[PDB]
Write an enzyme that holds these catalytic residues in place. Sequence first.
Site, PDB file in Angstrom:
ATOM      1  N   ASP A 230      70.544  44.531  50.115  1.00 37.49           N
ATOM      2  CA  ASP A 230      69.393  45.253  50.520  1.00 37.49           C
ATOM      3  C   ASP A 230      69.709  46.749  50.557  1.00 37.49           C
ATOM      4  OD1 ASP A 230      67.009  46.097  52.004  1.00 37.49           O
ATOM      5  OD2 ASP A 230      66.780  43.974  52.356  1.00 37.49           O
TER       6      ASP A 230
ATOM      7  N   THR B 209      61.341  46.038  51.236  1.00 39.84           N
ATOM      8  CA  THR B 209      62.141  44.818  51.181  1.00 39.84           C
ATOM      9  C   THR B 209      61.352  43.521  50.767  1.00 39.84           C
ATOM     10  OG1 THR B 209      63.880  45.695  52.642  1.00 39.84           O
ATOM     11  CG2 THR B 209      63.662  43.303  52.421  1.00 39.84           C
TER      12      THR B 209
ATOM     13  N   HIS C 204      69.521  53.451  56.707  1.00 34.53           N
ATOM     14  CA  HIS C 204      68.493  53.962  57.598  1.00 34.53           C
ATOM     15  C   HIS C 204      69.066  54.843  58.732  1.00 34.53           C
ATOM     16  CE1 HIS C 204      64.833  51.937  56.199  1.00 34.53           C
ATOM     17  NE2 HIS C 204      65.542  50.842  56.111  1.00 34.53           N
TER      18      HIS C 204
ATOM     19  N   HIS D 281      65.872  47.697  46.431  1.00 33.75           N
ATOM     20  CA  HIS D 281      65.346  49.115  46.356  1.00 33.75           C
ATOM     21  C   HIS D 281      66.548  50.002  46.750  1.00 33.75           C
ATOM     22  CE1 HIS D 281      65.446  48.899  50.631  1.00 33.75           C
ATOM     23  NE2 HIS D 281      64.652  47.839  50.568  1.00 33.75           N
TER      24      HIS D 281
ATOM     25  N   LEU E  53      43.563  44.514  33.724  1.00 32.00           N
ATOM     26  CA  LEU E  53      43.183  43.776  32.561  1.00 32.00           C
ATOM     27  C   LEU E  53      41.912  44.339  31.942  1.00 32.00           C
ATOM     28  CD1 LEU E  53      43.625  40.215  34.040  1.00 32.00           C
ATOM     29  CD2 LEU E  53      45.309  41.573  32.978  1.00 32.00           C
TER      30      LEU E  53
ATOM     31  N   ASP F  39      38.376  44.910  30.716  1.00 27.95           N
ATOM     32  CA  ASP F  39      37.030  44.507  31.207  1.00 27.95           C
ATOM     33  C   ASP F  39      36.270  43.887  30.066  1.00 27.95           C
ATOM     34  OD1 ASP F  39      37.650  45.652  33.682  1.00 27.95           O
ATOM     35  OD2 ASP F  39      36.059  47.187  33.425  1.00 27.95           O
TER      36      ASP F  39
HETATM   37  C1  LIG Z   1      50.386  39.360  36.374  1.00 25.54           C
HETATM   38  O1  LIG Z   1      50.698  37.942  36.256  1.00 25.54           O
HETATM   39  C2  LIG Z   1      49.761  37.074  36.869  1.00 25.54           C
HETATM   40  C3  LIG Z   1      50.074  35.577  36.597  1.00 25.54           C
HETATM   41  O2  LIG Z   1      49.954  35.248  35.211  1.00 25.54           O
HETATM   42  C4  LIG Z   1      48.343  37.396  36.418  1.00 25.54           C
HETATM   43  O3  LIG Z   1      47.543  36.845  37.456  1.00 25.54           O
HETATM   44  C5  LIG Z   1      46.719  35.794  37.087  1.00 25.54           C
HETATM   45  O4  LIG Z   1      45.491  36.361  36.710  1.00 25.54           O
HETATM   46  C6  LIG Z   1      44.423  35.507  36.204  1.00 25.54           C
HETATM   47  C7  LIG Z   1      43.154  36.335  35.840  1.00 25.54           C
HETATM   48  O5  LIG Z   1      42.848  37.319  36.935  1.00 25.54           O
HETATM   49  C8  LIG Z   1      44.135  34.470  37.302  1.00 25.54           C
HETATM   50  O6  LIG Z   1      43.356  33.413  36.763  1.00 25.54           O
HETATM   51  C9  LIG Z   1      42.297  33.004  37.672  1.00 25.54           C
HETATM   52  O7  LIG Z   1      42.690  31.882  38.509  1.00 25.54           O
HETATM   53  C10 LIG Z   1      41.689  31.411  39.440  1.00 25.54           C
HETATM   54  C11 LIG Z   1      42.334  30.178  40.066  1.00 25.54           C
HETATM   55  O8  LIG Z   1      43.444  30.741  40.775  1.00 25.54           O
HETATM   56  C12 LIG Z   1      44.107  29.908  41.774  1.00 25.54           C
HETATM   57  O9  LIG Z   1      45.054  29.015  41.190  1.00 25.54           O
HETATM   58  C13 LIG Z   1      46.180  29.649  40.541  1.00 25.54           C
HETATM   59  C14 LIG Z   1      47.059  28.551  39.929  1.00 25.54           C
HETATM   60  O10 LIG Z   1      47.709  27.710  40.904  1.00 25.54           O
HETATM   61  C15 LIG Z   1      46.961  30.606  41.491  1.00 25.54           C
HETATM   62  O11 LIG Z   1      47.913  31.385  40.774  1.00 25.54           O
HETATM   63  C16 LIG Z   1      46.000  31.578  42.186  1.00 25.54           C
HETATM   64  O12 LIG Z   1      46.711  32.431  43.134  1.00 25.54           O
HETATM   65  C17 LIG Z   1      45.970  33.650  43.511  1.00 25.54           C
HETATM   66  O13 LIG Z   1      45.109  33.481  44.620  1.00 25.54           O
HETATM   67  C18 LIG Z   1      45.830  33.083  45.841  1.00 25.54           C
HETATM   68  C19 LIG Z   1      44.872  32.901  47.013  1.00 25.54           C
HETATM   69  O14 LIG Z   1      44.822  31.469  47.103  1.00 25.54           O
HETATM   70  C20 LIG Z   1      46.977  34.014  46.281  1.00 25.54           C
HETATM   71  O15 LIG Z   1      47.860  33.362  47.216  1.00 25.54           O
HETATM   72  C21 LIG Z   1      47.862  34.432  45.117  1.00 25.54           C
HETATM   73  O16 LIG Z   1      48.660  35.548  45.652  1.00 25.54           O
HETATM   74  C22 LIG Z   1      46.964  34.784  43.896  1.00 25.54           C
HETATM   75  O17 LIG Z   1      46.257  35.988  44.270  1.00 25.54           O
HETATM   76  C23 LIG Z   1      46.162  36.916  43.148  1.00 25.54           C
HETATM   77  O18 LIG Z   1      45.243  36.490  42.093  1.00 25.54           O
HETATM   78  C24 LIG Z   1      43.852  36.332  42.496  1.00 25.54           C
HETATM   79  C25 LIG Z   1      42.991  35.779  41.319  1.00 25.54           C
HETATM   80  O19 LIG Z   1      43.361  34.381  41.029  1.00 25.54           O
HETATM   81  C26 LIG Z   1      43.374  37.674  43.110  1.00 25.54           C
HETATM   82  O20 LIG Z   1      42.027  37.540  43.574  1.00 25.54           O
HETATM   83  C27 LIG Z   1      44.320  38.183  44.236  1.00 25.54           C
HETATM   84  O21 LIG Z   1      43.989  39.533  44.569  1.00 25.54           O
HETATM   85  C28 LIG Z   1      45.732  38.276  43.683  1.00 25.54           C
HETATM   86  O22 LIG Z   1      45.743  39.304  42.640  1.00 25.54           O
HETATM   87  C29 LIG Z   1      44.791  30.837  42.822  1.00 25.54           C
HETATM   88  O23 LIG Z   1      45.198  30.159  44.039  1.00 25.54           O
HETATM   89  C30 LIG Z   1      40.311  31.151  38.780  1.00 25.54           C
HETATM   90  O24 LIG Z   1      39.280  31.114  39.784  1.00 25.54           O
HETATM   91  C31 LIG Z   1      39.898  32.261  37.806  1.00 25.54           C
HETATM   92  O25 LIG Z   1      38.716  31.834  37.111  1.00 25.54           O
HETATM   93  C32 LIG Z   1      37.492  32.612  37.266  1.00 25.54           C
HETATM   94  O26 LIG Z   1      37.162  33.464  36.144  1.00 25.54           O
HETATM   95  C33 LIG Z   1      37.064  32.681  34.919  1.00 25.54           C
HETATM   96  C34 LIG Z   1      36.909  33.544  33.670  1.00 25.54           C
HETATM   97  O27 LIG Z   1      37.878  33.066  32.713  1.00 25.54           O
HETATM   98  C35 LIG Z   1      36.027  31.537  34.975  1.00 25.54           C
HETATM   99  O28 LIG Z   1      36.181  30.699  33.830  1.00 25.54           O
HETATM  100  C36 LIG Z   1      36.278  30.653  36.201  1.00 25.54           C
HETATM  101  O29 LIG Z   1      35.227  29.711  36.457  1.00 25.54           O
HETATM  102  C37 LIG Z   1      36.402  31.538  37.427  1.00 25.54           C
HETATM  103  O30 LIG Z   1      35.065  32.065  37.577  1.00 25.54           O
HETATM  104  C38 LIG Z   1      34.443  31.602  38.799  1.00 25.54           C
HETATM  105  O31 LIG Z   1      35.008  32.353  39.909  1.00 25.54           O
HETATM  106  C39 LIG Z   1      34.695  33.763  39.866  1.00 25.54           C
HETATM  107  C40 LIG Z   1      35.572  34.557  40.855  1.00 25.54           C
HETATM  108  O32 LIG Z   1      35.553  33.928  42.142  1.00 25.54           O
HETATM  109  C41 LIG Z   1      33.155  33.840  40.040  1.00 25.54           C
HETATM  110  O33 LIG Z   1      32.716  35.201  40.208  1.00 25.54           O
HETATM  111  C42 LIG Z   1      32.467  33.163  38.813  1.00 25.54           C
HETATM  112  O34 LIG Z   1      31.042  33.170  38.873  1.00 25.54           O
HETATM  113  C43 LIG Z   1      32.912  31.700  38.584  1.00 25.54           C
HETATM  114  O35 LIG Z   1      32.168  30.725  39.361  1.00 25.54           O
HETATM  115  C44 LIG Z   1      41.037  32.704  36.847  1.00 25.54           C
HETATM  116  O36 LIG Z   1      41.463  31.770  35.858  1.00 25.54           O
HETATM  117  C45 LIG Z   1      45.415  33.850  37.906  1.00 25.54           C
HETATM  118  O37 LIG Z   1      44.996  33.312  39.178  1.00 25.54           O
HETATM  119  C46 LIG Z   1      46.449  34.938  38.306  1.00 25.54           C
HETATM  120  N1  LIG Z   1      47.637  34.391  38.965  1.00 25.54           N
HETATM  121  C47 LIG Z   1      48.245  35.025  39.986  1.00 25.54           C
HETATM  122  C48 LIG Z   1      49.421  34.293  40.532  1.00 25.54           C
HETATM  123  O38 LIG Z   1      47.896  36.105  40.467  1.00 25.54           O
HETATM  124  C49 LIG Z   1      48.045  38.896  36.406  1.00 25.54           C
HETATM  125  O39 LIG Z   1      46.834  39.023  35.763  1.00 25.54           O
HETATM  126  C50 LIG Z   1      49.152  39.683  35.674  1.00 25.54           C
HETATM  127  N2  LIG Z   1      48.883  41.087  35.815  1.00 25.54           N
HETATM  128  C51 LIG Z   1      48.773  41.913  34.761  1.00 25.54           C
HETATM  129  C52 LIG Z   1      48.367  43.340  35.069  1.00 25.54           C
HETATM  130  O40 LIG Z   1      48.996  41.495  33.623  1.00 25.54           O
HETATM  131 CA    CA Z   2      65.221  45.941  51.557  1.00 23.57          CA
HETATM  132 CA    CA Z   3      39.519  44.713  34.515  1.00 21.94          CA
HETATM  133 ZN    ZN Z   4      65.199  49.313  54.789  1.00 22.50          ZN
END
Ligand SMILES: *[C@@H]1O[C@H](CO)[C@@H](O[C@@H]2O[C@H](CO)[C@@H](O[C@@H]3O[C@H](CO[C@H]4O[C@H](CO)[C@@H](O)[C@H](O[C@H]5O[C@H](CO)[C@@H](O)[C@H](O)[C@@H]5O[C@H]5O[C@H](CO)[C@@H](O)[C@H](O)[C@@H]5O)[C@@H]4O)[C@@H](O)[C@H](O[C@H]4O[C@H](CO)[C@@H](O)[C@H](O)[C@@H]4O[C@H]4O[C@H](CO)[C@@H](O)[C@H](O)[C@@H]4O)[C@@H]3O)[C@H](O)[C@H]2NC(C)=O)[C@H](O)[C@H]1NC(C)=O
Ligand code: CA
Ligand code: CA
Ligand code: ZN
EC number: 3.1.4.39
Length: 805
Positions: free
Chosen positions: A121, A159, A265, A309, A689, A691
């Site tokens: 760390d 951390t 620190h 870090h 991503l 739009d």
């Molecule tokens: C970095 O890498 C990561 C990983 O590859 C990339 O993130 C992925 O991005 C995808 C697109 O944004 C996203 O896919 C979505 O998944 C939804 C289902 O997600 C759940 O299940 C998965 C799988 O087990 C899990 O990973 C998810 O975890 C997220 O949410 C939990 C809360 O329970 C958090 O604990 C976790 O930290 C994580 O949060 C992060 O992601 C969410 C989005 O999922 C953010 O909101 C948080 O801020 C945070 O960033 C979930 O538990 C699924 O619902 C999505 O589908 C919608 O849109 C599609 C269009 O294709 C549509 O077909 C579907 O029906 C659905 O639409 C409906 O819902 C809409 C929204 O509510 C609604 O408005 C519509 O009308 C529809 O009814 C979608 O497939 C994937 O989840 C994440 N994975 C992670 C881990 O984040 C990331 O993009 C990369 N970054 C870059 C810059 O490249």
């Molecule tokens: Ca640390």
């Molecule tokens: Ca976007």
């Molecule tokens: Zn520290």
Amino acid sequence: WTATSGSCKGRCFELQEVGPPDCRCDNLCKSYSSCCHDFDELCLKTARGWECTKDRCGEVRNEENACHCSEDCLSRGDCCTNYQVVCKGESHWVDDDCEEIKVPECPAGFVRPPLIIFSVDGFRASYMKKGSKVMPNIEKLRSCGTHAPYMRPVYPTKTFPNLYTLATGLYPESHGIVGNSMYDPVFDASFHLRGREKFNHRWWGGQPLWITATKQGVRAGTFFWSVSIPHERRILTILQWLSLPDNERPSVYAFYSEQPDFSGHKYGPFGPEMTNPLREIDKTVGQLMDGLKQLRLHRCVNVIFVGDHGMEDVTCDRTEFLSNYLTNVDDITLVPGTLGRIRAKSINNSKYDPKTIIAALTCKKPDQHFKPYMKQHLPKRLHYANNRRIEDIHLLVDRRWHVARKPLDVYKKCFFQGDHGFDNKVNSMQTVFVGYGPTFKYRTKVPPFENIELYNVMCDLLGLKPAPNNGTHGSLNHLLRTNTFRPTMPDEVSRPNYPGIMYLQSEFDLGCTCDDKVENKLEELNKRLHTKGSTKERHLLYGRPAVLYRTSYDILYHTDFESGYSEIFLMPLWTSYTISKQAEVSSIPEHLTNCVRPDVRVSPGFSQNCLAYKNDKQMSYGFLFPPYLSSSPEAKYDAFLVTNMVPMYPAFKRVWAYFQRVLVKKYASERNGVNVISGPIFDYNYDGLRDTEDEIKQYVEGSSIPVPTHYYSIITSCLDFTQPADKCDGPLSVSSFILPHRPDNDESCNSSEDESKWVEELMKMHTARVRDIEHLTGLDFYRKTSRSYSEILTLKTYLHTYESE
Ligand SMILES: *[C@@H]1O[C@H](CO)[C@@H](O[C@@H]2O[C@H](CO)[C@@H](O[C@@H]3O[C@H](CO[C@H]4O[C@H](CO)[C@@H](O)[C@H](O[C@H]5O[C@H](CO)[C@@H](O)[C@H](O)[C@@H]5O[C@H]5O[C@H](CO)[C@@H](O)[C@H](O)[C@@H]5O)[C@@H]4O)[C@@H](O)[C@H](O[C@H]4O[C@H](CO)[C@@H](O)[C@H](O)[C@@H]4O[C@H]4O[C@H](CO)[C@@H](O)[C@H](O)[C@@H]4O)[C@@H]3O)[C@H](O)[C@H]2NC(C)=O)[C@H](O)[C@H]1NC(C)=O
Ligand SMILES: [Ca+2]
Ligand SMILES: [Ca+2]
Ligand SMILES: [Zn+2]
Ligand SMILES: O=C(c1cc(OCC2CCOCC2)nc(C2CC2)c1)N1Cc2ccc(C(=O)N3CCc4onc(O)c4C3)cc2C1
Ligand SMILES: [Cl-]
Ligand SMILES: [K+]
Ligand code: NA
């Protein structure tokens, strides 16, 4: 509730943690306050220290002792790590010359080389050189293994966000650990370093390495160590697990140290007191390597030495206080320190207005040591917006400073001389990477890389398929002797149209005037051939970008530039052009100043129009291929095509014009030509991503012309700058940016001055990886080079940081 009444006999440092109220004996039982009554006595033995002595050689085993020097200790796997040195005349690992590890030299029964991840760390990158004399064991890992000169953490450089990123390959905004302190408004719950809420599994998103391993049948050691377990006991435990039979023994292990962070620190990163914690960590590394050597595993295991870090000099006296800015300071909650996050103290406060907060925090003192942002306006390289746990208002704090709400928070709490959490490109925040083992390269130095890439590499080392993550799998193949991951380029989803001349000038009604009625077969077949793509070899050096989504677009060829023109967004997705070291800048002639010309290849219906810009009093327009760099006055007309126009706020125009008129030429002189690819980005939902069309929140008044949230450029040249960019024979060099398309320059405090005093500073802050641009556009670049695809993936992950060495 705990029944601490059960026992830990033979369950010491159990890998399967048990459920309440049955009493636990795993390496975390203390941190949950649930250890069986006899945990200390059985599992935290300390009797006689951590080292064999000549007196103990061939002792009778006594089970009270912390470690053993009896004849049986190696078969039991619980010798003191120095047993063979003292009792059997062996050398310490650090005293042996290094010898290339060409294959895993493992006992029979090992199905793969185990992985040990040794995380430190607060281990700042410059400690590797500055502490080399006091860390011989680490120094031998580094010089004999594969090392980077530094590894870039994620933002914020704290951390838990970094440890969890190392575990998952995800940015904080995706894994959910966006700080060491968080408020989740959906749960209405708070996460803190201190306390129990952090153990609730709803905080922790994605899929961390130990889960990935377990799900694919690879057994994992426990990654987490209660702070009361001494380091020597953590090492011995790992060594004892390594001696287990084939079906019980884990394949992946982690050691964590709270040092040197704890001391940094108190004393600052280079305080004289820091020498001793660096010596102590090195000693712990030597116990591990000696221990592995006695088990005959020192040429079998892959070892990663990594930090979370670095550490900067920060003292009490360098605190900015928001009570100096805000009249309403009691109406906000601030997450303070080396970053700031602001929200309303009460959501029932209808007078809370983030705009007036931002305005009151903007360029108010001449050397203000923080800058306020709405989170969507933060540099896109930080990837620090798409999570409900990140407050809308962010303060980016200068290195060496703190931000706090009121003076009473910082003296009713100087103690500390070090801190971290700053912007992840700040050199003091950089950390370390060394890989040592049979799957790593021998005596190889690799370029700096980001910690989001390691999860994939850890999965490659263990034969696991990584969960979806933000790494770019294959970009770190150059660290590996074998188990490289060789991906294929993504398939192009939309193929381009190649339109010819299909529209007469009078079909257009653009309100766009151009004085271009200014007239030969020599030149006419030549201009025809440019329109069919005869110079494309020059301007499109690495192939056209592939479009990885379903859309309608056209390739448009010109003398000086080529573009991929979107019929849906009414502008280029990308524009590509090569400026040689010799190119001349000219100025826009007065007969063309407000000229925009119809492009007879593209329908009026898929074209922008000047009338919408005239009517929109906030919005103006610029060009993607800069008219300033046109090769001839005949080719200059191409630059004024309606299909090369993009919506620009006048405030952004000052930035863009300076980039195009001054900086492109300057980079061409320095780099011996450059290839430039520029375009628009639409990220209205700040998820990093591209739009879709229906996510677009703003259009030029009275039109279907969408407004970009950012403009990018990718500036590529020959890494060997003695070759010109258009005749490069070897590796490439790249710098890029993603500039925010904003209606003011409130971001740049010196913006009333000339652009040579502030634009470059802004561009540096918004430096980007190509890969960042790819996510934002749905484009794939560098499709046709000579180079290996992994080398191109390394290139696409490069970030030009503008920090000294
Ligand atoms: C970095 O890498 C990561 C990983 O590859 C990339 O993130 C992925 O991005 C995808 C697109 O944004 C996203 O896919 C979505 O998944 C939804 C289902 O997600 C759940 O299940 C998965 C799988 O087990 C899990 O990973 C998810 O975890 C997220 O949410 C939990 C809360 O329970 C958090 O604990 C976790 O930290 C994580 O949060 C992060 O992601 C969410 C989005 O999922 C953010 O909101 C948080 O801020 C945070 O960033 C979930 O538990 C699924 O619902 C999505 O589908 C919608 O849109 C599609 C269009 O294709 C549509 O077909 C579907 O029906 C659905 O639409 C409906 O819902 C809409 C929204 O509510 C609604 O408005 C519509 O009308 C529809 O009814 C979608 O497939 C994937 O989840 C994440 N994975 C992670 C881990 O984040 C990331 O993009 C990369 N970054 C870059 C810059 O490249
Ligand atoms: Ca640390
Ligand atoms: Ca976007
Ligand atoms: Zn520290
Ligand atoms: O064992 C772990 C651990 C280890 C871990 O490893 C994940 C691995 C890391 C290597 O790559 C694979 C994943 N993760 C995790 C979790 C993400 C899953 C945890 N601990 C104990 C411990 C004890 C105290 C503290 C702590 O509060 N401070 C010390 C550091 C620090 O700096 N500034 C400060 O103020 C503080 C204060 C943090 C940890 C982390
Ligand atoms: Cl935080
Ligand atoms: K206008
Ligand atoms: Na300004």
